[PDB]
Design a protein around this ligand. Structure first.
Ligand code: 16G
Ligand code: 16G
Lengths: 248, 248
């Protein structure tokens, strides 16, 4: 009955929905990532604002793939920007996504994961459209409910999911808040990061397992806060350095 | 049996452990945050690397408290820094934590949440020690198992949890990886961000509910990606601007 327990039960239920409903889509996404690695492509992940956090959770990560890179749009990497409200405004700027994609090392055949809960703003929609125009395969992580219950803010009138090769439905109801209190007019307690991080790990875990099943050793990193982790990672990062862009 | 399902079941089980084991600690932490707001103090959250992501998840957040601020240590806000490996090295630098605390607006009586899974490195340990020396109340979000199974890398030989007023145990087993495959030597698939984000939301949800029960309207933000959210937030951010440091 207490707020902590109510929220955790809501987050568990959302993870159960993802587990039971997105299993095939999660498998398809992880296989696409494994295919890209095997065929010599690169892997990148992007999200704006708090959606950036699920993307960061698979980059340079204990237990994660060394080959996963972060696509950084300046000002929307998390909420670090001053003022934080500018991050919201940058999501409406046409041409930012193309500037970032055209400057990056992404090329035809690469894989880009795009996390956007609403999927409705110019920046994530343009990112998917332009990435596909460049020949990239695009996985979207998005709450498809928003496409029926909100209006697109992109000039095309379309949503992120309309421009993805694979869509992972992150389930969050419109408003991104799981609890209400009678005395309190606004809902509170967002689970979207709990859910999207879990989806991303499920996707990358599938890619690692798929490579292994094909007799290809997945390039996995260890935690740097367990003795020997940094030594282990140095070997891996050097080995796959050519397709890793967060070190040299 | 598939990797996605195995990971999601592991993450659910960790959320159940937090729900069933940390309920009283979560209540105590949220009450301390509510007490601080009521007594006129400020709220800040910090973590390094991927632990920064749980801190960011409660800042400028749909359904979250407008009064929660991010404490930014340059170079360890997420994994954005180039090269990402420098973030790991910065966690070992003595004096960085004090530099950041002494420059910030944090003052005696304020509340600081510190997220560190291992709790073993110089930066998070110094952050807690120096914050308490400044008169701050400190909530740590940390896997206490690390304090018995790893060695401290702080000069004191102590861990984060030894310097907290309240400890929230994030349960993750040493290594931060929930899956193994027979052919694959390293474990993979980290849940720490799934778990820590959920703990943080449970804490802030408790603070909002506690304020409400005391007849104090919690200063909650709405999603900017639902129509009217930015207008709603502008009112709130102006009202509580004096204790909000991510806008002006
Ligand atoms: C109060 C608030 O909402 N702040 C931002 C929001 O402006 C931004 O749009 C979202 C990412 O957008 P997306 O996940 O829907 O793509 O992250 C944050 O929530
Ligand atoms: C491969 C790797 O591990 N990268 C960093 C790690 O160096 C850092 O220590 C941790 C935060 O540390 P903490 O959560 O234990 O405080 O975030 C990331 O995992």
């Amino acid at each position: 009955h207490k707020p902590a327990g109510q929220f955790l039960d809501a987050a568990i239920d959302l993870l159960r929905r993802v587990r039971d409903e997105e299993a095939d889509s999660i498998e398809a996404a992880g296989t696409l990532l494994a295919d890209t690695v095997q065929n010599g492509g690169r892997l990148f992940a992007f999200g704006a604002g708090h959606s950036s956090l699920a993307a960061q959770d698979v980059v340079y990560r204990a237990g994660g793939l060394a080959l996963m890179n972060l696509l950084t749009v300046p000002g929307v990497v998390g909420i670090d920007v001053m003022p934080a409200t500018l991050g919201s405004a940058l999501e409406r700027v046409d041409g930012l996504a193309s500037a970032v994609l055209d400057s990056s090392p992404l090329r035809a055949g690469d894989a880009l994961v795009i996390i956007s809960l609403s999927g409705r703003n110019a920046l994530p929609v343009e990112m998917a459209m332009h990435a596909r125009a460049l020949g990239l395969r695009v996985i979207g992580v998005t709450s498809v409910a928003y496409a029926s219950q909100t209006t697109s803010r992109h000039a095309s009138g379309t949503f992120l999911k309309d421009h993805c090769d694979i869509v992972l439905d992150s389930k969050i109801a419109v408003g991104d808040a799981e609890l209400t209190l009678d005395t309190v007019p606004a809902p509170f307690a967002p689970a979207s990061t709990v859910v999207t991080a879990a989806l991303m790990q499920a996707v990358t875990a599938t890619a690692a397992a798929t490579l292994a099943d094909r007799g290809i050793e997945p390039p996995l990193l260890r935690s740097g806060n367990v003795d020997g982790g940094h030594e282990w990672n140095a070997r891996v990062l050097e080995q796959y350095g050519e397709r890793i862009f967060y070190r040299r």
